[PDB]
């Protein structure tokens, strides 16, 4: 109970004092349970009746559970925390399972009244002060103050996890052969030894823990093989996602989809190829919480497949240190790439997805690059090192793109993987003009107001065309022209644009866009043999551009 640990000095933000909130003198069906409870804690040292002093107070409501013996005193420190100094924010992350080194036969421990077994700062105890009213409506209230962590006082998961560690510290030394994982009141002592001798140890940490004030359960040490954990299912030689509920409704809302997609994002860790692009493409109608959102024809087809995927249970393996990590990717199109990190055939530690960054103009190589990346940053967390990559692209296709990309990229260390689709740049622009190819001088503006434009051109051979556009942007007529030239022109052509934008979009060789316009342009590029795009400053006297620049 009362741990002989040293205490962590605690205080309050500079210039504040204890919370002096009072008790709504309540009942006696409960101003009884309280006195029963408190007095029982009072014995165990968890608390001590405090004098007739200055101490502030805190509300002490009570409630009743549904399995039957009795009530719980639940003090509400909300106003004590507000005043309590900040703390070294504990592990905000969760130790993902695909990276806990396999072991023969693991154990687990469930620390007892953890919070209540750690002594509180002998000087910050006076701010834990509270009182329960009289057994009668008269008021000679009862006064107490905490001597251990309050149950949800601000600093508790911190000063606990702290003290815990400084205890396990000396144990782990005398036993450099056990990796004990810590998370909340859960210990993950596990190792690979005869199963009998091992227990001799768990029944040893336990002695040591209880030795110092911390208690642990026991069928002998309580849990069997199927462990639950923050959503995981950890077997003794495998981990997996706890079961998922992908529903079927006749009505969905902006609240029904976050649940769905949210549930869908989680399952992907191990469920290979969980497409969820169109479903999330929905959560942005508007962000109302409850909204009759009509499923789309594409989502219901996407969800139908996600279901078929989940209709079959898949497992996950544990990390083997000596063996290394290998990660492989594969593009599902639409900017939906899926991967899986492994060490051996048919044994993945985890698989995941890489969305399209929800942008407007990006080509596979770019994405594949950002894909490798996501996986890299991540592998450095779960495992600590980066993996060998098996990317669906040839060193030849890559070399091209980066040596010709204004940005400094760095795909690290890969091997080719022949399994279509294979990442490739579909169209390429002539680095220099083309001699025996007509030159289309294009341009197309539009009325920012009336939203009416016209795209067109004028060429050396003297051909001219002006196609009227309606309900268009300025950038729309800007690309409408390049697309128009690609139409009217022959097998190889040179285009002159006054459009910074138009150019860049194309000089981005961005395949896979949504915008029908781009794809038409992209499609028309494909068909062309040799194309050279040129940019000249408009409205600058080009006796050759100050043409379409005036025709449109």
Ligand X SMILES: OC[C@H]1O[C@H](O)[C@H](O)[C@@H](O)[C@@H]1O
Ligand Y SMILES: COc1ccc2ccccc2c1/C=N/NC(=O)c1ccc(O)c(O)c1
Ligand Z SMILES: OC[C@H]1O[C@@](CO)(O[C@H]2O[C@H](CO)[C@@H](O)[C@H](O)[C@H]2O)[C@@H](O)[C@@H]1O
Which residues sit in the known binding site for Mg(2+)? Answer: 110, 185-186, 443, 478, 498, 549
Residue appearing with tokens 């990796």: 179
Smallest gap from Cβ 227 to ligand Y, in A, equals 4
* From candidates 56, 77, 115, 401, binder to ligand X by CB under 6 A: 115
Q: Rounded to whole angstroms, how far apart are CA atoms 383 and 245?
A: 30
Letters for 477-516 (x = contact with another protein by CB under 8 A, - = none) are: -----------------x-x---x---x--x---------
Q: Rounded to whole angstroms, how far apart are CA atoms 100 and 112?
A: 25
Residues 283-322, interacting with ligand X (CB under 6 A):
none
State the binding partner of 231 from ligand X, ligand Z, ligand Y, none, CB within 5 to 8 A by kind. Answer: ligand X
Q: Rounded to whole angstroms, how far apart are CA atoms 138 and 140?
A: 7
Which residues sit in the known binding site? Answer: 110, 185-186, 443, 478, 498, 549
| C-alpha R_g of the chain | 34
Q: How far is CA 23 from the centre of its chain?
A: 42
* From candidates 24, 88, 346, 406, binder to ligand Z by CB under 6 A: 346
Q: Residue 32 to residues 28, 139, 141, 143, 295: CA-CA distances in angstroms? A: 5, 14, 12, 14, 55
Give, for 343, the enclosing helix (H) or strand (E): strand 337-344
| DSSP class of 12 | B
Give, for 81, the enclosing helix (H) or strand (E): helix 78-81
Q: Rounded to whole angstroms, how far apart are CA atoms 425 and 147?
A: 68
* From candidates 15, 140, 345, 543, binder to ligand Z by CB under 6 A: 345
Specify the residue, 20 or 43, whose C-beta has the smaller distance to ligand X: 43
480 binding ligand Z? (CB under 6 A): no
CB 509 within 8 A of CB 470: no
Structure tokens at 307: 């279901």
Smallest gap from Cβ 226 to ligand Y, in A, equals 6
Letters for 56-85 (x = contact with another protein by CB under 8 A, - = none) are: -----------------------------x
CB 288 within 8 A of CB 254: yes
Smallest gap from Cβ 270 to ligand X, in A, equals 12
Q: Which long-range contacts (CB under 8 A, 24 or more apart) does 67-75 make?
A: 70/33, 70/36, 71/30, 71/33, 71/37, 72/37, 73/33, 73/34, 73/37, 73/38, 74/151, 75/130, 75/150, 75/151
Specify the residue, 280 or 338, whose C-beta has the smaller distance to ligand Z: 338
Smallest gap from Cβ 520 to Mg ion, in A, equals 20
Residues 341-370, interacting with another protein (CB under 8 A):
369-370
* From candidates 42, 113, 192, 523, binder to ligand X by CB under 6 A: 113
* From candidates 250, 396, 435, 450, binder to another protein by CB under 8 A: 435
Residues 277-306, interacting with another protein (CB under 8 A):
none
348 binding ligand Z? (CB under 6 A): yes
Residues 255-274, interacting with ligand X (CB under 6 A):
262-263, 265-266
Specify the residue, 128 or 369, whose C-beta has the smaller distance to ligand X: 128
Specify the residue, 342 or 414, whose C-beta has the smaller distance to ligand Z: 342
Residues 509-538, interacting with Mg ion (CB under 5 A):
538
Q: Rounded to whole angstroms, how far apart are CA atoms 532 and 428?
A: 9
340 binding ligand Z? (CB under 6 A): yes
* From candidates 61, 212, 227, 535, binder to another protein by CB under 8 A: 535
Q: Rounded to whole angstroms, how far apart are CA atoms 339 and 390?
A: 10
> Which residues contribute to the site for ligand X (CB under 6 A)?
113-116, 151, 184-185, 230-231, 262-263, 265-266
> Which residues contribute to the site for ligand Z (CB under 6 A)?
340, 342, 345-346, 348
């Amino acid at each position: 109970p009362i741990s002989p640990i040293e205490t962590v000095p605690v205080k309050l933000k500079p210039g504040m004092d204890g919370p002096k909130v009072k008790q709504w003198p309540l009942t006696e069906e409960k101003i009884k349970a309280l006195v029963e409870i408190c007095t029982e804690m009072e014995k165990e040292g968890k608390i001590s009746k405090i004098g007739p002093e200055n101490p502030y107070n805190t509300p002490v409501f009570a409630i009743k559970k549904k399995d039957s013996t009795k009530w719980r005193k639940l003090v509400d420190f909300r106003e004590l925390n507000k005043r309590t100094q900040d703390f070294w924010e504990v592990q905000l992350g969760i130790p993902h399972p695909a990276g806990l080194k396999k072991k023969k036969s693991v154990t687990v421990l469930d620390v007892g009244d953890a919070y209540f077994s750690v002594p509180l700062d002998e000087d910050f105890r006076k701010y834990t002060a509270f009182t329960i009213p009289s057994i009668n409506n008269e008021t000679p209230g009862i006064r107490y103050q905490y001597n251990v962590l309050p149950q949800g006082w601000k600093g508790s998961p911190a000063i606990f996890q702290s003290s815990m560690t400084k205890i396990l510290e000396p144990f782990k030394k005398q036993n450099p052969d056990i990796v004990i994982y810590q998370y909340m009141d859960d210990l993950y002592v596990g190792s690979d030894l005869e199963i009998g001798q091992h227990r001799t140890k768990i029944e040893e940490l336990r002695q040591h823990l209880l030795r110092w004030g911390l208690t642990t359960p026991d069928k002998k040490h309580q849990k069997e093989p199927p462990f639950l954990w923050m959503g995981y299912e950890l077997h003794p030689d495998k981990w997996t996602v706890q079961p998922i509920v992908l529903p079927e409704k006749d009505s969905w809302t902006v609240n029904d989809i976050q649940k769905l997609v949210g549930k869908l994002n989680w399952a992907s860790q191990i469920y290979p190829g969980i497409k969820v692009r169109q479903l999330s493409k929905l959560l942005r109608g508007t962000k109302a919480l409850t909204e009759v959102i009509p499923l789309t024809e594409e989502a219901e087809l996407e969800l139908a497949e996600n279901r078929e995927i989940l209709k079959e249970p898949v497992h996950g393996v544990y990390y083997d240190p000596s063996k290394d990590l290998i990660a492989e990717i594969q593009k599902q199109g639409q900017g939906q790439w899926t991967y899986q990190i492994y060490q051996e055939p048919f044994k993945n530690l985890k698989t995941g997805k890489y969305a399209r960054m929800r942008g407007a103009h990006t080509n596979d190589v770019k994405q594949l690059t950002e894909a490798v990346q996501k996986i890299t940053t991540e592998s450095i967390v779960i495992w600590g090192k980066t993996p060998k990559f098996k990317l669906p692209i040839q060193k030849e296709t890559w070399e091209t793109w980066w040596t010709e990309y204004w940005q400094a990229t760095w795909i690290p260390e890969w091997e080719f993987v022949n399994t279509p689709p294979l990442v490739k740049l579909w169209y390429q622009l002539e680095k220099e003009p083309i001699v025996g190819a007509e030159t289309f001088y294009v341009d197309g503006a539009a009325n920012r107001e009336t939203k009416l434009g016209k795209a067109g051109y004028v060429t050396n051979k003297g051909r001219q065309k002006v196609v009227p556009l309606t309900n268009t942007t300025n950038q729309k007529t800007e690309l409408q022209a390049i697309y128009l030239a690609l139409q009217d022109s022959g097998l190889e052509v040179n285009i002159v644009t006054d459009s910074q934008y138009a150019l860049g979009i194309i000089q981005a060789q961005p395949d896979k866009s949504e915008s029908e316009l781009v794809n038409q342009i992209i499609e028309q590029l494909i068909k062309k043999e040799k194309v050279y795009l040129a940019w000249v400053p408009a409205h600058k006297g080009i006796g050759g551009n100050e043409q379409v620049d005036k025709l449109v």
